Amino acid sequence: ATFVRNAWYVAALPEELSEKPLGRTILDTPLALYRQPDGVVAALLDICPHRFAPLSDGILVNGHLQCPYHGLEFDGGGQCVHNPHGNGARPASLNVRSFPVVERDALIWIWPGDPALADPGAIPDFGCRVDPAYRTVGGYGHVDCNYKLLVDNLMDLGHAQYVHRANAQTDAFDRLEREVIVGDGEIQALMKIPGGTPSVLMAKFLRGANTPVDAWNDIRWNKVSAMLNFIAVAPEGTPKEQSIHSRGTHILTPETEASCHYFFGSSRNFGIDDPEMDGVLRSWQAQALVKEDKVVVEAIERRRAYVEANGIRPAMLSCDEAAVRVSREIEKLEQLEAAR
Amino acid sequence: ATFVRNAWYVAALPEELSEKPLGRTILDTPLALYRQPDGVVAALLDICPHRFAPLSDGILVNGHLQCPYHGLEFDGGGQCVHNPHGNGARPASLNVRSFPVVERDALIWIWPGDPALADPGAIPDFGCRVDPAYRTVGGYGHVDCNYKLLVDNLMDEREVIVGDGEIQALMKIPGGTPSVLMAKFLPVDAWNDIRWNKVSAMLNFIAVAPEGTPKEQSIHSRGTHILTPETEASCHYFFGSSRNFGIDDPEMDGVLRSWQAQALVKEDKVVVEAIERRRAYVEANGIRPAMLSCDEAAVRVSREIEKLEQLEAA
Amino acid sequence: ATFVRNAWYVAALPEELSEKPLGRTILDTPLALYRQPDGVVAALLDICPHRFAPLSDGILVNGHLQCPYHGLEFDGGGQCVHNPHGNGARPASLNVRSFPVVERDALIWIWPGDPALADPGAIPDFGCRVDPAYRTVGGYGHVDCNYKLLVDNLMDLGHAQYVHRANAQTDAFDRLEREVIVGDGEIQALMKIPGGTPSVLMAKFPVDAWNDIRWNKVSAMLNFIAVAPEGTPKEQSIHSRGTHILTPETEASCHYFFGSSRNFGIDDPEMDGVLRSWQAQALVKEDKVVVEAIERRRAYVEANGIRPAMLSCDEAAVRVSREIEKLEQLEAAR
Numbered sequence A: 001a002t003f004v005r006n007a008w009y010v011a012a013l014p015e016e017l018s019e020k021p022l023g024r025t026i027l028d029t030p031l032a033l034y035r036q037p038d039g040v041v042a043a044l045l046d047i048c049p050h051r052f053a054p055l056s057d058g059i060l061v062n063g064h065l066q067c068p069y070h071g072l073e074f075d076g077g078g079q080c081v082h083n084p085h086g087n088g089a090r091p092a093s094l095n096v097r098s099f100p101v102v103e104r105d106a107l108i109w110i111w112p113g114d115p116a117l118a119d120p121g122a123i124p125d126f127g128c129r130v131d132p133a134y135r136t137v138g139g140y141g142h143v144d145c146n147y148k149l150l151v152d153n154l155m156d157l158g159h160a161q162y163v164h165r166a167n168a169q170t171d172a173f174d175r176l177e178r179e180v181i182v183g184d185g186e187i188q189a190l191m192k193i194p195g196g197t198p199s200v201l202m203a204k205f206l207r208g209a210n211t212p213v214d215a216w217n218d219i220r221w222n223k224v225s226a227m228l229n230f231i232a233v234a235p236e237g238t239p240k241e242q243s244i245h246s247r248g249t250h251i252l253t254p255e256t257e258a259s260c261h262y263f264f265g266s267s268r269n270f271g272i273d274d275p276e277m278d279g280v281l282r283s284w285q286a287q288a289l290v291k292e293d294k295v296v297v298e299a300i301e302r303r304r305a306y307v308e309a310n311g312i313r314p315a316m317l318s319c320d321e322a323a324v325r326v327s328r329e330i331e332k333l334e335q336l337e338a339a340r
Numbered sequence B: 001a002t003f004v005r006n007a008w009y010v011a012a013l014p015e016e017l018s019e020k021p022l023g024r025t026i027l028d029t030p031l032a033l034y035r036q037p038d039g040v041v042a043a044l045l046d047i048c049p050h051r052f053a054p055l056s057d058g059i060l061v062n063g064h065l066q067c068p069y070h071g072l073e074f075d076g077g078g079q080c081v082h083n084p085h086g087n088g089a090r091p092a093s094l095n096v097r098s099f100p101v102v103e104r105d106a107l108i109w110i111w112p113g114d115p116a117l118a119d120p121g122a123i124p125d126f127g128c129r130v131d132p133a134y135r136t137v138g139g140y141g142h143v144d145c146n147y148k149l150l151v152d153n154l155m156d157e158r159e160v161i162v163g164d165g166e167i168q169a170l171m172k173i174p175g176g177t178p179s180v181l182m183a184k185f186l187p188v189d190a191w192n193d194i195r196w197n198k199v200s201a202m203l204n205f206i207a208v209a210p211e212g213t214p215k216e217q218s219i220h221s222r223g224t225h226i227l228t229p230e231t232e233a234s235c236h237y238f239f240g241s242s243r244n245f246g247i248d249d250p251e252m253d254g255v256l257r258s259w260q261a262q263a264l265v266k267e268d269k270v271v272v273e274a275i276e277r278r279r280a281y282v283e284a285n286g287i288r289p290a291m292l293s294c295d296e297a298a299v300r301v302s303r304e305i306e307k308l309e310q311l312e313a314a
Numbered sequence C: 001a002t003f004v005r006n007a008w009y010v011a012a013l014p015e016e017l018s019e020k021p022l023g024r025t026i027l028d029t030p031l032a033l034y035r036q037p038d039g040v041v042a043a044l045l046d047i048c049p050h051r052f053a054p055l056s057d058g059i060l061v062n063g064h065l066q067c068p069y070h071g072l073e074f075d076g077g078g079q080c081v082h083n084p085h086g087n088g089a090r091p092a093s094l095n096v097r098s099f100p101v102v103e104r105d106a107l108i109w110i111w112p113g114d115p116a117l118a119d120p121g122a123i124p125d126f127g128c129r130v131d132p133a134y135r136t137v138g139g140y141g142h143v144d145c146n147y148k149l150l151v152d153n154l155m156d157l158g159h160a161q162y163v164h165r166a167n168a169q170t171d172a173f174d175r176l177e178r179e180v181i182v183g184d185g186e187i188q189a190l191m192k193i194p195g196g197t198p199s200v201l202m203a204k205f206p207v208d209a210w211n212d213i214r215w216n217k218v219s220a221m222l223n224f225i226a227v228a229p230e231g232t233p234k235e236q237s238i239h240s241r242g243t244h245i246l247t248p249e250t251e252a253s254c255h256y257f258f259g260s261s262r263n264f265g266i267d268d269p270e271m272d273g274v275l276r277s278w279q280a281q282a283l284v285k286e287d288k289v290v291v292e293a294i295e296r297r298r299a300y301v302e303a304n305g306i307r308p309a310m311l312s313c314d315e316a317a318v319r320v321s322r323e324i325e326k327l328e329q330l331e332a333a334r
């Protein structure tokens, strides 16, 4: 598998983690992820340097992760801090690899490449997730596809018109206005849907109001595979910036070449103290993201062998510009990294 | 990934198909099989030309299959007939592969190979299946073995008659014994014949009459036994019978629709699936099967298949 | 992948075998194992020479294994003895491979390698299993690891302080002493565990305990777990001699034959229960979970050239591992 290792990836949502380790593989690298007694998250290679047992099946002893096999103890920097055996000697050979972690924007970011190069300034901005003006709900999904298929999915949100038609179909789809803005390490795909009846989802945002609206569904990509969308709806002619909206976290992290982790969320500026609106967004996430999109991209992954064996290449449509530009940027990053 | 692609295979029974597409893989080729509003069956490659979504997860829009991902619509010839996006242009690059398909003898026949060579006149004759003189019932099953194993099993006064892409194994038993099924409709002759056509389509003839009687006027069933490879190690099995006895008996219909009664009893499925699991060992150790006297027809068939494979190798 | 094929392996416990065949794969070789009416065990390649059906799914007819598919019948030497078809001729091509088998010490040993070379004198000694002075209970487990991982597990029995902490803990761990003695195709790790409080298990039979293990090539081990009052001679201890015998199934899976042969409470059903409970919990659950997890990490370890870092407890396991690697490479280079 080719992955871009010198980049930050979301490995977990903070609420997934505790003093009980979580074993999760990112970029074909098995990790043991836990929150220490002092609250700091650690990420260790989930392979004990002694005989390769899963540290993730161990427990904390004195805030130190104890290997379940012969009881070596490790701190969050991977240092072996206790060896129960013989003279108890702890040479550097017993230290386990530790991965840089930044807990930011209610995300656990990990750097899986050269730890010397881990630069917190490179972490994409998802500040809305911790902004008290936004209400955020979301979760985790596992998907049996190459993460690039879900990047493709997200970078053409037009797919919602079909894949999510029961919730997302608009009668103004024929009048979509698209632009693509290309920045440095960042690409935006903008979509405005002018003058339509609100979709079923947008009508729920508005609490049933069914008169004509403008809607937007923009998305921002940052390398490698972190996206933030803007789903918004307002009375015709009222500015974007004044709209009720959800900024959607859509972040992918490769697991294996043919599987990935999907971290999703909605950060909304409306109905902030409304458990029933929470439910609308959670049920949307459960149906759209973890069911419908999964089913499409997992089917596409199953067709990979045929496509490759037969030299089949995708045929592009007018809606693909942003997805293609992103795909080419990822490929470029992949090749740059394969040189190092 | 060794198949004989240049041949007609059954992909479905007609009763499986409707305006809701069926996704089924034959010879490692995923198909979307559906009936258009005019009744006519279409068979498209189950891979959208845009981004490779399963067209079989789509629905018809004005009789045209719509990709479930971004809404490209296709006709039964695979032509893209609507592009929702932008200027709506439909360059030839948006067309999807369509397979030669013939509905005949209550079977859906598909040609997975070189479409230039697909001659509908070469489709095997299963006419009994739509002959009103016969009551025809049957069904479908899936098996986790190479189809050749089931062909071998099927093909096991004798005579074996060998022709070009057809082989017949005939057996007559004078003073023979009615099958349990037929006994009650009767000093008998019995017949058990089977006909193979390339690659894996068989029709048997199981019959009993008073001695003397033209086997053509016997009490008899003609059994449909048609295999289609799914992967190298799995197959589809279409079975059925066309009978001239008890034609209005629904209980008889029932037992003749049973997979285990008519096609493959569980104990034999266990055996053939186990044989498939021994393939790796057999190949690694250069082990070849040892044939018995009962294998004569199966061997002849096996050799013809291998020749057809070898042709396609280049 | 690479196995030591020229060696005896346990393929079954005798109690697993009957006139109903058992299909089991050893060293990537599928076998049909059964007991003939005269009591003699046969082991045939589980691939009918006709069309490759599992003979192990058939039954015996007049003491002969009958293929379930078209009913060829075979004797214990693999000779085809009946062909129900045609003239019933039995050409030599119908015979099936039969493997050398020795039933000894309440074990079924099979030689999967060059049959010219199978010397029954080479089978290691597990005589306690049929010694009237000992009571033996045990069984079979399947494990999704390469057998060498479970050899490691068994040869460093100081994982029991952690993996088996609920049953096997003892404070005296601080003060382990462990002696490795190397012999010819045989390695032992010995151990006094002195003056200590007994582990939960020991209590179920201040104490001295011992926990020795003997390995013989390829992967056959017998341990010695013993406790006695402080100051008591190792040899007057109540003890269990543990059968711990591994046989490769595939590159990444194995068969585990375990047993306890004890010299105490030998008429006592409650003790049977303590031992069978330990075997169930320790060997088939806890150790299984660890080694199966390590197996899953193999791809990463190999891809990244990672080598193990050894501790003071590892000598015996390392010596054994070196001997197996040596046998494995000695064979593949011929």
Ligand code: FES
Pocket (backbone or CB within 6 Å): A048, A049, A050, A051, A052, A053, A067, A068, A069, A070, A071, A072
């Ligand atoms: S494998 Fe971790 S201490 Fe031995």
Ligand code: FES
Pocket (backbone or CB within 6 Å): B048, B049, B050, B051, B052, B053, B067, B068, B069, B070, B071, B072
């Ligand atoms: S994958 Fe079919 S329209 Fe996009």
Ligand code: FES
Pocket (backbone or CB within 6 Å): C048, C049, C050, C051, C052, C053, C067, C068, C069, C070, C071, C072
């Ligand atoms: S496969 Fe055993 S008798 Fe035919």
Ligand SMILES: [Fe+3]
Pocket (backbone or CB within 6 Å): A153, A159, A160, A163, A164, A288, A289, A293
């Ligand atoms: Fe979606």
Ligand SMILES: [Fe+3]
Pocket (backbone or CB within 6 Å): C153, C159, C160, C163, C164, C282, C283, C287
């Ligand atoms: Fe253990």
